[PDB]
Amino acid sequence: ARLQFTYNHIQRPVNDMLGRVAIAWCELCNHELTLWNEARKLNPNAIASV
Amino acid sequence: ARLQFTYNHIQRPVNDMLGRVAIAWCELCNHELTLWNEARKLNPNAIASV
Ligand SMILES: *[C@@H]1O[C@H](CO)[C@@H](O[C@@H]2O[C@H](CO)[C@@H](O)[C@H](O)[C@H]2NC(C)=O)[C@H](O)[C@H]1NC(C)=O
Numbered sequence: 001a002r003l004q005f006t007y008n009h010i011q012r013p014v015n016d017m018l019g020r021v022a023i024a025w026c027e028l029c030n031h032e033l034t035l036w037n038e039a040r041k042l043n044p045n046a047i048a049s050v
Numbered sequence: 051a052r053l054q055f056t057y058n059h060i061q062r063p064v065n066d067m068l069g070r071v072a073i074a075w076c077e078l079c080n081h082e083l084t085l086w087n088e089a090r091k092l093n094p095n096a097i098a099s100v
């Protein structure tokens with residue numbers, strides 16, 4: 001709990017590694033939400049039921 | 051083949067593990083089938099061709 005962010009040489013690789021993961025999830029969400037929000041415009045009964 | 055489902059303490063963790071995998075696949079299929087079925091309603095020639 002004390003030793004976590006105190007080592008720049010350990011944390012620098014991690015910020016880049018996890019930062020890329022966070023960005024990947026954002027790109028998937030924007031892609032999926034766009035398709036889902038267009039489908040609900042056409043058939044809200046099916047999308048709501050699912 | 052004789053031992054498989056005989057040890058409850060081994061099988062209980064497995065049912066809880068694989069049950070989640072099966073549920074995850076069901077959720078993906080319902081999501082994908084719904085989008086695919088709406089696209090098919092709009093352009094059957096493209097969806098059938100692929
Ligand atoms: C990352 O988190 C650490 C805490 O783990 C932050 O470091 C503290 O910063 C304050 C303000 O200068 C100091 O008073 C503390 O002594 C620091 N704590 C330790 C354990 O070093 C740090 O500011 C954060 N980094 C960024 C860029 O936000």
Ligand SMILES: *[C@@H]1O[C@H](CO)[C@@H](O[C@@H]2O[C@H](CO)[C@@H](O)[C@H](O)[C@H]2NC(C)=O)[C@H](O)[C@H]1NC(C)=O
Pocket residue numbers: 052054055056
């Ligand atoms: C899970 O599979 C096992 C078989 O591996 C089932 O256990 C058998 O149950 C019948 C009915 O009580 C017994 O006659 C057998 O002797 C049992 N076999 C063994 C090797 O123990 C079990 O019934 C299945 N689980 C469920 C929910 O029914």
